[PDB]
Structures are given as structure tokens and as C-alpha cells.
Design a protein around this nucleic acid. Structure first.
Ligand SMILES: *C(=O)c1cnc2ccccc2n1
Ligand SMILES: *C(=O)c1cnc2ccccc2n1
Length: 8
DNA sequence: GATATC
DNA sequence: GATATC
């Protein structure tokens, strides 16, 4: 759920 | 480092 | 299960 390097 | 909503 | 980036 975090949106950092992936954004899910 | 830099992590939480589906 | 469902994950990558400066
Ligand atoms: C988002 O809350 C979150 C938490 N754990 C994960 C594990 C693997 C892929 C994506 C994820 N997203
Ligand atoms: C993004 O590429 C990425 C990869 N690994 C992580 C681990 C912990 C927090 C954030 C992250 N972001």
C-alpha cells in the first residue's frame, strides 16, 4: 500500500 | 534509507 | 499474494 520505489 | 492499503 | 526507485 505505500507509494514510494513501488506505488501500490 | 525506506514502506504500508489493498 | 502483491512491491520496486531513486
Ligand atoms: C501495502 O500496504 C503493501 C504491503 N505489503 C506489500 C508486500 C508486497 C507487495 C506489496 C505490498 N504492499
Ligand atoms: C522502492 O524501490 C523500495 C524498495 N524497497 C523498499 C524497502 C523498504 C521501504 C521502501 C522500499 N522502497
Amino acid at each position: 500500500x505505500a507509494x514510494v520505489x513501488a506505488x501500490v
